[PDB]
Amino acid sequence: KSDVFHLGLTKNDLQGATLAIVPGDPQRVEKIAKLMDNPVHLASHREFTSWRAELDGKAVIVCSTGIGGPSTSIAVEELAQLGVRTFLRIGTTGAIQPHINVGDVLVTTAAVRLDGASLHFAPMEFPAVADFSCTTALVNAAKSVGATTHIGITASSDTFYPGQERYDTFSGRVVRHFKGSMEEWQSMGVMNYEMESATLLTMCASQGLRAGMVAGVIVNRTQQEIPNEETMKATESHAVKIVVEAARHLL
Template identity: 50%
Template sequence: MSQAAGRQYHIGLGEADIEGARYALLPGDPGRVPQLARGVGARAVELGQHREHCSWLAYIAEQPVLVCSTGLGAPSTAVAVEELANIGVTHFIRVGTSGSIQPHIDYSDLVISKAAVRLEGTSSHYAPLAYPAVASFELTASLVASARALDIPHHVGITASSDTFWPGQERYDNHSGYVLRRFQGSMAEWRQLKVTNFEMEAAALFTVCATFGLSAACVCGVIAKRVESEEVRPEAYGLAEQRWNAVLAKTLGERLSRKPEK
């Protein structure tokens, strides 16, 4: 049996495991998978864990939705997308945390990415740097419509996806306290260019999915305000989680309840 038809090497899942799910929610942290699955679905079932990829099925509008962690950063995200596509997933939504770099974006607000700056290296293995990292319009518009309908604070913008948590996001609280010259002043430059936030996966997700003809979107909760400090505030996570769960449940509930087109 070919790998495409059977159990995938890294995620440890096969086509039969996901029960025909076409949508996948992709948190980075394996520890967040159970809460996310339970938070968006009427019921949720654990599938298992292989490496950094913890997987559950959530049932929304009586349809299965896969929740699978990607691990931290772009390389493992690309691996997860490739293998999930092999077993039939066509729509991918990254769900994670982020640091805002615009003063009007507050703690626990949601940022829905319409595109991403390719500060990571993984996407260049799929397309040249001139190729844009752009989210799927229809899927992203559904998330925005849900956030508006629920009156949840949100922002639609361009995300900067870095390969590193510290230097690439111009954090001076790293081990050495030093940031390479090419990153010094970079946060102010991205702010001037109206970039909304830093994270580490969206650019790879958007690029990989676009080159494969798949749909991708990204929603992140703000747990750091970089215009104020480099501090991450874990207490902002709970409200952000409530907000993205509500947006995702509404979005997927509506999309999965639609009658299939003839």
């Protein structure tokens, strides 16, 4: 009954939308859609919850990716089969540089490919680079709403734990290749870790699709505080504001 294998959507469901905002968490989709006009629930299958809304009179889709490159790759492919050509990722993230503060915004120009799915689209030599128009719209949007913004490289990991050098785990073990890797990325000016951008950016850049990514900083691993839940939600809302404002300039 669906037109795609996983999302549970038909072409008609999108009502001509060609831009998607793609958060990770299905439970966050509704909140984003409600910033815009006539928000409606389209489907919820597996980790993929999708809502439609209208932005300056144009249909947009908000669709969750789940955690990681593999589910992200399914969402992007199936949305592309449904007519989406522009993908904007919104998230919240840690930072790994001392000058980046909680509440700041990160716009990702390109990703360190510590994932597997990106390799299914392009060999490692190929850059996991964002579309310039999307990045520009995100930077301008952040400037417009008075954000403190950092623009640069993000490390994109297939794991939350060892790939980000976390040792407070069941085994306490980090495999050799990843032990000391965080210090390496820090030394090269990498801003932060997350888990989807290498796949998203590589997939889009090699498939004629436009992608960008913005995130709000909720923790800094170099001066690590327990996040205040109110502050997290405020930073999340701030990043969501930026991604929607950027989308307006990409329609």
